[PDB]
């Protein structure tokens, strides 16, 4: 079931599962860094939270350069 909607639904419910998200407000260009008020600390929290949920090795530069949930969807689409 590894299409675009499976990856997008799984990223959607795990960012639902994240608690401190301010506000809910998920978008394909949501940009939770500078539209939702989250630091690089919470950036790397979210990235390795995906890695904790099902993830790959997710190297720290490729982990470091994601910044946006739809690009995370396309990143797992590129890697899975």
């Amino acid at each position: 079931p590894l299409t675009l909607e499976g990856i997008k639904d799984r990223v959607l419910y795990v960012l639902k599962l994240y608690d401190k998200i301010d506000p809910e407000k998920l978008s394909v260009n949501s940009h939770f860094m500078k539209d939702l008020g989250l630091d690089s600390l919470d950036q790397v929290e979210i990235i390795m939270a995906m890695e904790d949920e099902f993830g790959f090795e997710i190297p720290d530069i490729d982990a470091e350069k994601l910044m946006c949930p739809q690009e995370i969807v396309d990143y797992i689409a590129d890697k899975k």
Binding site: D19, S40, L41, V44, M48, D52
Partner: protein, 114 residues
């Protein structure tokens, strides 16, 4: 005044190292709070971890950021080992108050002090 470096040549590798250490301290906290048989919720622990990272927000020198990364990695060595004790990890918490104020007025009644 070209100082010999520690690890990097500018601050970008320092940022990479400190975010990697924060990744490690994120995944290592619930192991310790499950292992030392404490009495603290996991989210309280993770939030005081990121508070202890945010305590050093103003640091800019690359050698100094490298040395903080080396300190944090040495303590994560000491917590992947069980070489420390319950006392030290509770000592990172500030739970026995110490409720010492910040207002001028309470510091005036309990005074001799600014």
């Amino acid at each position: 005044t070209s100082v010999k470096p520690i690890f990097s040549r500018d601050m970008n590798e320092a940022k990479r190292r400190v975010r990697e250490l924060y990744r490690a301290w994120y995944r290592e906290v619930p192991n310790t709070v499950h292992l030392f048989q404490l009495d603290i919720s996991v989210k309280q622990g993770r939030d005081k971890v990121r508070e202890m990272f945010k305590k050093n927000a103003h640091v800019t020198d690359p050698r100094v950021v490298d040395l903080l990364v080396i300190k944090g990695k040495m303590e994560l060595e000491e917590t992947i080992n069980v070489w420390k004790q319950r006392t030290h990890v509770m000592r990172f918490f500030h739970e026995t108050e110490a409720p010492r104020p910040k207002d001028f007025l309470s510091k005036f009644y309990v005074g001799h002090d600014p």
